[PDB]
């Protein structure tokens, strides 16, 4: 799975045990797994188990979750996006 | 993500922020991402971010979205298909 | 498909004919198929059909299923996890 600082999960609206897609900007690999919470303030992004074959320390990734909803709701939906820089600093 | 002329999104019923599959006819790669609107009229199909590893400028692709519904409705369901000629000129 | 000792399916809440993901720790391959029951007690994890191209005997894998539910329920959801030691001996 991928262990993710709980602050980051909150900012992106991603839940513990939720399915996530990881898109690796560095090497182009794309895979799906689930999220687990890391300690708040740790700034951890840990790719564990089999997924360690698809990402390495230092790689830049996008981690996304998807939900379903009816069409009218979808047409006004605004995703929760957290942007990062530096030492996995969340941009405000 | 993949930024796509709003006119194209309109024709295919694909929404901003909707999950999409991209199937590359040129190189056979297949991947899933989400759609973002590019300007209307621009003809843009821009493969951004990590996805740029799966397609190059000039590649021919199919971009598709999927929805769920009960079996009874699915039996008569009709998808929205847009067809292209020349340089992203919608016919 | 992947045939799996019914005892293992029971522990993980995975059903016969349910969609499953298999993530191969040994070779990094990731694929999706459906589960079938192998005899109870047998310890069998058998990768059948086309899937045999993605795993070999002795490979260590993770087998997972996913369900949907509303956000309100998902917030407290607890998955069913089974852990293994030695030769598929469930602990």
């Amino acid at each position: 799975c991928c262990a993710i600082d709980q602050d980051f999960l909150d900012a992106a609206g991603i839940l513990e045990n939720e399915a996530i897609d990881i898109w690796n900007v560095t090497n182009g690999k794309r895979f799906s797994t689930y999220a687990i919470a890391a300690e708040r303030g740790s700034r951890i992004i840990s790719v564990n188990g089999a997924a360690a074959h698809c990402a390495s320390v230092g790689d830049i990734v996008i981690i996304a979750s998807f939900v379903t909803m009816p069409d009218e709701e979808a047409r006004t939906w605004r995703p929760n996006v957290a942007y990062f820089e530096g030492d996995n600093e969340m941009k405000r | 993500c993949c930024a796509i002329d709003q006119d194209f999104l309109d024709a295919a019923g694909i929404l901003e922020n909707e999950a999409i599959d991209i199937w590359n006819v040129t190189n056979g790669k297949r991947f899933s991402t989400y759609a973002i609107a590019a300007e209307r009229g621009s003809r843009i199909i821009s493969v951004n971010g990590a996805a740029a590893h799966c397609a190059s400028v000039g590649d021919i692709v199919i971009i598709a979205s999927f929805v769920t519904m009960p079996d009874e409705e699915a039996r008569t369901w009709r998808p929205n298909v847009a067809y292209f000629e020349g340089d992203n000129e919608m016919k | 498909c992947c045939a799996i000792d019914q005892d293992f399916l029971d522990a993980a809440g995975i059903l016969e004919n349910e969609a499953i993901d298999i993530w191969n720790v040994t070779n990094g391959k990731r694929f999706s198929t459906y589960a079938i029951a192998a005899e109870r007690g047998s310890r069998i994890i058998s990768v059948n059909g086309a899937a045999a191209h993605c795993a070999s005997v002795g490979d260590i894998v993770i087998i997972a299923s996913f369900v949907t539910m509303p956000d309100e329920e998902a917030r407290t959801w607890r998955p069913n996890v089974a852990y293994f030691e030695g030769d598929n001996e469930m602990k």
């Binding site: 564990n48 390495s56 069409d71 995703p79 942007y83 | - | 852990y83």
Partner: peptide, 28 residues
């Protein structure tokens, strides 16, 4: 309404986060 067509939408994302640890042997 019953039978409405249901969309799959981006709920949220972490954009351009850096991997800090990658461990093949995770036993959780």
């Amino acid at each position: 309404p019953r039978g409405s067509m249901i969309r799959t939408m981006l709920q949220g994302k972490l954009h351009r986060v850096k991997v800090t640890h990658a461990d093949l042997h995770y036993e959780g």
